[PDB]
Design a protein around this ligand. Structure first.
Ligand SMILES: [Ca+2]
Ligand SMILES: [Ca+2]
Ligand SMILES: [Ca+2]
Ligand SMILES: [Ca+2]
Ligand SMILES: [Ca+2]
Length: 318
């Protein structure tokens, strides 16, 4: 099934680890290698225990100390790595909504790729942490059908995968055909209801039937019928239905596409999926882009930041 690249470290000694981190920061200077070599070789749960022992032994906050010692991208990677797994997605969403503006590629990327079970956990954590309702903050920072689609997904009430009903597959495929290609204009409400609430296994069948009856892949029709945030979200949902690892592998690829690199996106994906499906993401990356994720990162990043990412990612050969 799904496989991550980071797992619990055998022979874990939180207190021992904490002292190593302390010695790497005490006195003038910072031993970045020691810190990165250790934190990327411990699971997220173990990092939290190290943070606890650190505070018990020295009465100091590990994260705050590292924010003082580290700088730049490397610092941001480490801070993201120390973020509790249960709160990371909520943290990112909160920071995509806060301030004047809103990073919609972040809202779209997370809300479309996370399962209903993950979204329920995210909604809870967000509320506890920031004292506000996630849905309400999303509604407040977005509008139109893009907003409605996001709200539909945030309900996390997608139908469960059951036995496939061929007639319902034909019905849904024809409904999409009629709502888009055969309509002057577009019936967005129809696309949202179907793509947002039908079961994954069901939609995979619908996608093939749609192709069969219309000659177009659902992705092409979406591009031909919609635009803006809505188009990006619909494409993300369709891609996620087909394969979450594939979608995220594509999200990463375009992050390091050409000039410069989208570091924020590079960090978020690697960190958030490290203990879930980053291994799968690697395989999908290699199979669709003729290169390994490792190499891509290897030539798109520099310094400690680079060394840290590579250890997390792994797979020098893929
Ligand atoms: Ca120091
Ligand atoms: Ca805003
Ligand atoms: Ca149309
Ligand atoms: Ca378009
Ligand atoms: Ca680049």
């Amino acid at each position: 099934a799904l496989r991550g690249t980071v797992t619990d470290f055998s022979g874990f000694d939180g207190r021992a680890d904490a002292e190593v981190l302390r010695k790497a920061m005490e006195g003038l200077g910072t031993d970045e290698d020691s810190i990165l070599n250790l934190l990327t070789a411990r699971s997220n749960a173990q990092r939290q225990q190290i943070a606890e022992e650190f505070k018990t032994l020295f009465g100091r906050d590990l994260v705050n100390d590292m924010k003082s010692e580290l700088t730049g991208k490397f610092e941001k990677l480490i801070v993201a790595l120390m973020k509790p797994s249960r709160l990371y997605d909520a943290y990112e969403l909160k920071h995509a909504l806060k301030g004047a503006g809103t990073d919609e590629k972040v809202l779209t990327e997370i809300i479309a790729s996370r399962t209903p079970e993950e979204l329920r956990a995210i909604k809870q954590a967000y509320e506890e942490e920031y004292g506000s309702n996630l849905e309400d903050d999303v509604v407040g920072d977005t509008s139109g059908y893009y907003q409605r689609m996001l709200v539909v997904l945030l309900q996390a009430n997608r139908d469960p995968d059951t036995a496939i009903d061929d007639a319902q597959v034909e019905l849904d495929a024809q409904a999409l055909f009629q709502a888009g290609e055969l309509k002057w204009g577009t019936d967005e409400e129809k696309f949202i209801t179907i793509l947002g609430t039908r079961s994954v296994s069901h939609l995979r069948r619908v996608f093939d039937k749609y192709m069969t009856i219309s000659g177009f892949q659902i992705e092409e029709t979406i591009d031909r019928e919609t635009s803006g945030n809505l188009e990006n979200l619909l494409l993300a949902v369709v891609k996620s239905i087909r394969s979450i690892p594939a979608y995220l592998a594509e999200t990463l690829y375009y992050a390091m596409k050409g000039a410069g690199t989208d570091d924020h996106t590079l960090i978020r994906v690697i960190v958030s999926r490290s203990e879930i499906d980053l291994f799968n993401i690697r395989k999908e990356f290699r199979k669709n882009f003729a290169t390994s994720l490792y190499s891509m990162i290897k030539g798109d990043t520099s310094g400690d930041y680079k060394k840290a990412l590579l250890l997390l990612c792994g797979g020098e050969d893929d």
